[PDB]
Motif scaffolding. Structure first.
Motif, PDB file in Angstrom:
ATOM      1  N   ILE A   1       0.851  -1.193   0.000  1.00 19.93           N
ATOM      2  CA  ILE A   1       0.000   0.000   0.000  1.00 19.93           C
ATOM      3  C   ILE A   1       0.890   1.248   0.000  1.00 19.93           C
ATOM      4  O   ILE A   1       0.590   2.229  -0.667  1.00 19.93           O
TER       5      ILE A   1
ATOM      6  N   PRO B   1       0.083   4.092  -3.430  1.00 20.43           N
ATOM      7  CA  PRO B   1      -1.122   4.688  -2.828  1.00 20.43           C
ATOM      8  C   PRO B   1      -2.350   4.494  -3.736  1.00 20.43           C
ATOM      9  O   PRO B   1      -2.211   4.492  -4.969  1.00 20.43           O
ATOM     10  N   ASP B   2      -3.505   4.247  -3.104  1.00 17.46           N
ATOM     11  CA  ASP B   2      -4.815   3.975  -3.750  1.00 17.46           C
ATOM     12  C   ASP B   2      -4.900   2.591  -4.423  1.00 17.46           C
ATOM     13  O   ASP B   2      -5.873   2.299  -5.112  1.00 17.46           O
TER      14      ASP B   2
ATOM     15  N   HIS C   1     -10.194   1.802  -2.510  1.00 15.71           N
ATOM     16  CA  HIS C   1      -8.846   2.326  -2.634  1.00 15.71           C
ATOM     17  C   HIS C   1      -8.205   2.356  -1.244  1.00 15.71           C
ATOM     18  O   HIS C   1      -8.822   2.810  -0.277  1.00 15.71           O
TER      19      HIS C   1
ATOM     20  N   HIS D   1      -4.966   3.338   1.414  1.00 17.66           N
ATOM     21  CA  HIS D   1      -3.787   4.199   1.621  1.00 17.66           C
ATOM     22  C   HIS D   1      -3.371   4.150   3.093  1.00 17.66           C
ATOM     23  O   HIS D   1      -4.189   3.793   4.005  1.00 17.66           O
TER      24      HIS D   1
ATOM     25  N   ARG E   1       2.613   5.107   7.407  1.00 16.73           N
ATOM     26  CA  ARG E   1       3.791   5.683   6.757  1.00 16.73           C
ATOM     27  C   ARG E   1       5.002   5.569   7.691  1.00 16.73           C
ATOM     28  O   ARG E   1       6.120   5.201   7.229  1.00 16.73           O
TER      29      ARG E   1
END
Ligand SMILES: CCCCCCCCCCCCC
Ligand SMILES: CCCCCCCCCCCCC
Lengths: 146, 143
Positions: free
Chosen positions: A46, A50-51, A94, A96, A102
């Motif tokens: 992921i 992203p998405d 989607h 993220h 992160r």
DNA sequence: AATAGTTTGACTGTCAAATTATG
DNA sequence: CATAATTTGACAGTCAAACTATT
């Protein structure tokens, strides 16, 4: 002179039996202690893309979609990822990373970076280039065996 | 570039497991996982290894090992024998069937590795050897 | 008191099958 | 009917902690 096969076999066996355990131990000793090495793989997909959708994570990880859904439920519950319903196709989700996602994604990269730096220890820039060609060739050989 | 070295190492590792799994499931031993094959190999290479030594080698807890050994013993691949010198201690040994699969597995690995080395240049082999050593040592240094 | 091994309870990882919503 | 996702059911594998047996 080639390395002795006995030493090759010994090194490969240690590596294959222990590498996933050692990575998991490094994550469990981190400041984020509730992420397994398999969840770290989902986080990794992921974070790089992203998405991405569950279907794409499934193909990328080579497990079924049910399996990906369970992992994403645990990761959303634990605050590492967010699911977002597509507005073009309302069947599609989607994915993220949250900020927390992160943060741990970064940490898993420092590990991979320490590993590559140890791999090339003592090698010259031409040996590193050769090693790059060696890996692509080994990769390609194994791809053609399945 | 370090990220793409990492991408190759991961794909290689992942392909190796796929190829091991397909070879196991295609064999006459259809009740054996990759992880059980690893345990069989530890016992085959070191006859009379104890559960504690298996646990140390595979870096799993002893309880996890006991459970696995119960499964392998039930399925006819290993035997437990209590030590005569210290009756807390169990010695492990492959059965006839365990030696058969161990032997077939060692042959499969040797042939594959030899085939891989056969298709590489002398310089590739020199440097792949040095990286293998370094990778082995990276992990060994974290244990 | 200490050690080697086992058992137990809970949880993850995994797939197949049945399910919900959407195209 | 096909696709994207989810949920459920049914299993390995795993750990931590409790337990058993032996030294
Ligand atoms: C079991 C298949 C994976 C093995 C591929 C690694 C081969 C390493 C060869 C290194 C060569 C050193 C001489
Ligand atoms: C998690 C991936 C790391 C393990 C990859 C092992 C592959 C063995 C290839 C050996 C050659 C290293 C230079």
């Amino acid at each position: 002179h080639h390395m002795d096969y006995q030493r090759i076999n010994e090194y490969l066996t240690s590596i294959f039996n222990n590498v996933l355990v050692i990575e998991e131990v490094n994550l469990r000793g981190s400041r984020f202690k509730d992420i397994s090495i398999k969840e770290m793989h989902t986080i990794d997909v992921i974070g790089k893309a992203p998405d991405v959708t569950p279907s794409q994570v499934s193909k990328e990880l080579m497990v079924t979609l049910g399996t990906v859904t369970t992992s994403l439920n645990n990761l959303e519950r634990k605050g590492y990822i967010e699911r977002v319903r597509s507005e073009q196709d309302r069947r599609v989700v989607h994915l993220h990373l949250t900020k927390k996602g992160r943060l741990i994604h970064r940490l898993h990269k420092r590990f991979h970076k320490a590993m590559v730096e140890k791999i090339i220890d003592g090698m010259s820039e031409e040996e590193i280039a050769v090693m790059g060609k060696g890996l692509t060739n080994l990769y390609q050989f194994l791809e053609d065996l399945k």
